[PDB]
Amino acid sequence: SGIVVSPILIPENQRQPFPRDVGKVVDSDRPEGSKFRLTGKGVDQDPKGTFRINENTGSVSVTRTLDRETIATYQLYVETTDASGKTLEGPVPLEVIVID
Q: Residue 18 belongs to a domain with what CATH number?
């Protein structure tokens, strides 16, 4: 029944400690054993490691303070996979806006 996403808003210049949770992806009618994987510019592509997703919960987090004037929006991708890493759903786009 598939991945449901809504655009994620992050205020620029967040304070530490990081990471901090900023949004949540949901898998409708989620299969047992399913896990979340996040990819894209800001995750596995420059600037790397800016965002993460919790493989269990779909909660998306940011790992550092951001500046809208550096990058104002990210297009990430999320999928669900089995324990082995084999894709079950997606990848689908997930949008993030850095708010000034």
A: 2.60.40.60
